[PDB]
CSV table of C-alpha atoms in Angstrom, one decimal:
chain,number,residue,atom,x,y,z
S,1,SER,CA,-19.5,18.5,14.6
S,2,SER,CA,-18.5,17.0,17.9
S,3,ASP,CA,-21.9,18.5,19.2
S,4,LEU,CA,-23.7,22.0,19.9
S,5,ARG,CA,-24.8,21.5,23.3
S,6,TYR,CA,-21.8,21.1,25.8
S,7,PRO,CA,-19.7,24.1,25.5
S,8,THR,CA,-15.8,23.6,26.5
S,9,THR,CA,-13.4,24.9,23.6
S,10,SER,CA,-15.6,28.2,22.4
S,11,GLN,CA,-14.4,26.0,18.7
S,12,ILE,CA,-15.8,23.9,17.3
S,13,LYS,CA,-14.2,19.9,17.3
S,14,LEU,CA,-15.0,18.9,14.0
S,15,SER,CA,-14.1,14.6,13.5
S,16,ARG,CA,-13.9,13.3,9.8
S,17,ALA,CA,-16.2,10.7,8.9
S,18,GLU,CA,-14.0,7.3,6.4
S,19,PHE,CA,-15.4,6.1,3.6
S,20,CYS,CA,-12.8,4.4,1.4
S,21,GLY,CA,-12.1,4.5,-1.5
S,22,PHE,CA,-13.2,8.2,-1.5
S,23,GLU,CA,-10.7,10.5,-3.3
S,24,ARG,CA,-11.9,14.8,-4.0
S,25,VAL,CA,-13.3,13.5,-7.7
S,26,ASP,CA,-16.1,11.1,-5.5
S,27,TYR,CA,-16.9,14.2,-3.2
S,28,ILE,CA,-17.8,17.1,-5.3
S,29,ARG,CA,-20.9,15.1,-6.7
S,30,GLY,CA,-22.5,13.6,-3.7
S,31,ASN,CA,-25.6,15.1,-1.2
S,32,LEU,CA,-26.8,15.1,1.8
S,33,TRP,CA,-30.4,13.9,3.1
S,34,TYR,CA,-31.8,14.7,6.0
S,35,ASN,CA,-35.5,15.2,6.9
S,36,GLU,CA,-36.4,18.8,8.2
S,37,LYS,CA,-38.5,18.0,12.2
S,38,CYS,CA,-38.3,20.2,14.5
S,39,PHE,CA,-38.0,18.0,17.8
S,40,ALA,CA,-38.5,21.0,20.4
S,41,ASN,CA,-38.9,19.1,23.5
S,42,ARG,CA,-37.2,16.1,22.6
S,43,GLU,CA,-39.6,12.4,23.2
S,44,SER,CA,-37.9,9.5,23.6
S,45,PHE,CA,-38.8,7.7,20.7
S,46,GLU,CA,-37.6,11.1,18.4
S,47,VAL,CA,-33.8,10.0,16.4
S,48,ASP,CA,-33.1,11.8,13.9
N,1,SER,CA,-6.3,-17.6,6.9
N,2,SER,CA,-8.0,-18.3,10.2
N,3,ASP,CA,-5.2,-20.8,11.4
N,4,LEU,CA,-3.3,-23.7,10.8
N,5,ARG,CA,-3.1,-25.5,14.3
N,6,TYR,CA,-6.6,-25.9,15.0
N,7,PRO,CA,-8.6,-27.7,11.8
N,8,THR,CA,-12.4,-27.5,12.2
N,9,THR,CA,-14.1,-28.2,9.6
N,10,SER,CA,-11.1,-29.5,6.4
N,11,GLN,CA,-11.8,-26.5,4.7
N,12,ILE,CA,-9.2,-23.3,4.9
N,13,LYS,CA,-11.3,-20.0,5.7
N,14,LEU,CA,-9.7,-16.8,4.7
N,15,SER,CA,-10.7,-13.6,5.5
N,16,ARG,CA,-10.8,-10.9,3.8
N,17,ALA,CA,-7.4,-8.0,4.7
N,18,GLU,CA,-9.3,-4.5,5.1
N,19,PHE,CA,-7.3,-1.9,2.6
N,20,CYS,CA,-9.4,2.1,2.4
N,21,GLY,CA,-8.4,3.2,-1.4
N,22,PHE,CA,-7.3,0.1,-2.4
N,23,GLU,CA,-8.8,-0.8,-6.4
N,24,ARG,CA,-7.5,-3.6,-8.8
N,25,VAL,CA,-4.6,-1.0,-10.3
N,26,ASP,CA,-3.1,-1.4,-6.6
N,27,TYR,CA,-3.4,-5.1,-5.9
N,28,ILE,CA,-1.5,-6.2,-9.2
N,29,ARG,CA,1.5,-3.2,-7.5
N,30,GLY,CA,2.1,-5.0,-4.4
N,31,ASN,CA,5.2,-6.9,-2.8
N,32,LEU,CA,5.0,-9.1,0.7
N,33,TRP,CA,8.3,-8.8,2.6
N,34,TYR,CA,9.0,-11.6,5.6
N,35,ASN,CA,11.5,-12.8,6.9
N,36,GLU,CA,11.9,-16.4,6.8
N,37,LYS,CA,12.4,-17.9,10.2
N,38,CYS,CA,11.5,-20.9,12.0
N,39,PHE,CA,9.9,-20.9,15.5
N,40,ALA,CA,10.1,-24.8,16.7
N,41,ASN,CA,9.8,-24.8,20.1
N,42,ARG,CA,8.1,-21.2,20.0
N,43,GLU,CA,10.3,-19.7,22.5
N,44,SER,CA,7.5,-16.7,24.8
N,45,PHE,CA,10.1,-13.8,23.1
N,46,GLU,CA,9.6,-15.4,19.0
N,47,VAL,CA,7.0,-13.1,17.2
N,48,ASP,CA,6.6,-13.0,13.2
């Protein structure tokens, strides 16, 4: 998604990431890993 | 090749172009087309 803090069109605008050489049979075997950490007041050193 | 009119290292420096989605079975089936034209004095409107 483009971003969530700047509502402009009331509809999410998706951008497709590029991955060279990747067909459909690769995307069906692929996982997303993310560290669940809350950034409430958004200190400057906090990066996701 | 980098260029031919500015020799610097006495060895041709080749840069590999990118083709996202292309493996060896695609490179074995490919052809190069070029219009054989001589630009001796290299007029400004002449491009390759």
